[PDB]
């Protein structure tokens, strides 16, 4: 059926001939909990190359629209935001995407986790990959599981930047990251950092610990796939004004009265499956501002967020927080 617009009035201010093009990786994330990131208070070093690298920000407090995949990565990109949400009819709405795409920016979506839940579909099919196929992610045979990492999909990302060279760019990567119930096959050996592991796919039988070794070795593998994209998008910066944004999809159940997984309904699940790290790095270049990191933020800042990277202005959105400032120093 028809697409319903919601963004017609947008407007993007400058354009890639009279400014520097932008270039923007936006990594989403999977099952990642804020309560377990080092930055938000948690005992372990579970990013510790994001800690070396400046100007990343990390924001303390911020909540998905919902516990599972298909729920929550259209209402990422959504402009309904997730009071109005619906989600058997978000794949007809236009979408931040659409929005970025008929102004001339150029979209890129790998996937390294099952597909884009829709928000992919209105735009040309070339533009989505499946980064699972050990035809295209080349990181597939470094675990004895013969997993395809998410690292891969940085490879030939210059291939696409050169194809596009001189526009706007936005690169959504989608991550496999800390999906369960199989933490321990997430990540490679050189990650196997806190030990014992579960290495059992019944988390209940695993002793507790062993099963926080696991999902804490996962994030360790997710920090190192953000360091090494913006380490990729640091190769770029003479030419383009780069920046990442990392949200993850919702958080997961470690156990917590006997619960594991996620994806319960909002109304009763507990804060552990909807509390999720977000984290934004810029170049010193770009003039791009981060709100603060206390900031009480939602999904609902992403799409405004991805608009702003771009100048674009939509009306629909013109109230909300985005994870960065409206305000640029000169
Ligand atoms: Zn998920």
């Known amino acids: 059926k028809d697409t319903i617009y919601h963004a017609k009035d947008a407007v993007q201010a400058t354009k890639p001939d009279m400014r520097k093009p932008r270039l923007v990786v936006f990594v989403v994330g999977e099952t990642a909990r804020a309560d377990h990131v080092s930055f938000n208070g948690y005992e372990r070093d579970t990013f510790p190359q994001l800690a070396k690298i400046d100007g990343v920000t990390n924001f303390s407090n911020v909540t998905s629209c919902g516990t599972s995949t298909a729920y929550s990565v259209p209402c990422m990109f959504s402009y309904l935001g997730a009071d109005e949400y619906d989600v058997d009819t978000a794949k007809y709405q236009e979408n931040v995407l659409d929005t970025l795409d008929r102004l001339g920016v150029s979209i890129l979506w790998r996937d390294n986790n099952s597909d884009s839940k829709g928000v992919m579909d209105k735009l040309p099919k070339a533009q989505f990959a499946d980064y699972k196929s050990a035809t295209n992610n080349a990181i597939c045979n470094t675990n004895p599981y013969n997993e395809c990492r998410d690292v891969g999909m940085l490879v030939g990302l210059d291939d696409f930047v050169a194809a596009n060279n001189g526009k706007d760019m936005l690169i959504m990567l989608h991550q496999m990251g800390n999906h369960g119930p199989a933490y321990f096959k997430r990540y490679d050996e050189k990650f196997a950092k806190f030990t014992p592991v579960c290495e059992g796919n ?5 002793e507790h610990q062993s099963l926080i070794n696991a999902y804490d ?3 360790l593998a997710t920090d190192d796939f953000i360091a090494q994209s913006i ?11 780069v920046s990442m944004l ?16 996620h994806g319960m309904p909002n109304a009763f699940a507990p804060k552990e499956q909807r509390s999720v790290p977000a ?12 709100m603060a990191t206390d900031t ?13 990277l771009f100048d674009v202005t939509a009306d629909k959105v013109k109230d909300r927080t985005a994870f960065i400032r409206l305000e640029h120093h000169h």
């Open 202 to 206: 019944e988390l209940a039988k695993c």
């Open 279 to 290: 984290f934004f790095w810029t170049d010193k270049q770009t003039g791009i501002t981060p």
């Open 296 to 308: 009480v933020l939602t999904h609902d800042a992403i799409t405004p967020t991805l608009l702003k």
């Open 231 to 241: 380490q990729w998008l640091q190769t770029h910066s003479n030419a383009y004004d």
């Open 246 to 261: 990392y949200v993850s999809d919702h958080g997961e159940s470690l156990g917590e009265n006997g619960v594991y997984l």
């Open 217 to 219: 070795n996962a994030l």
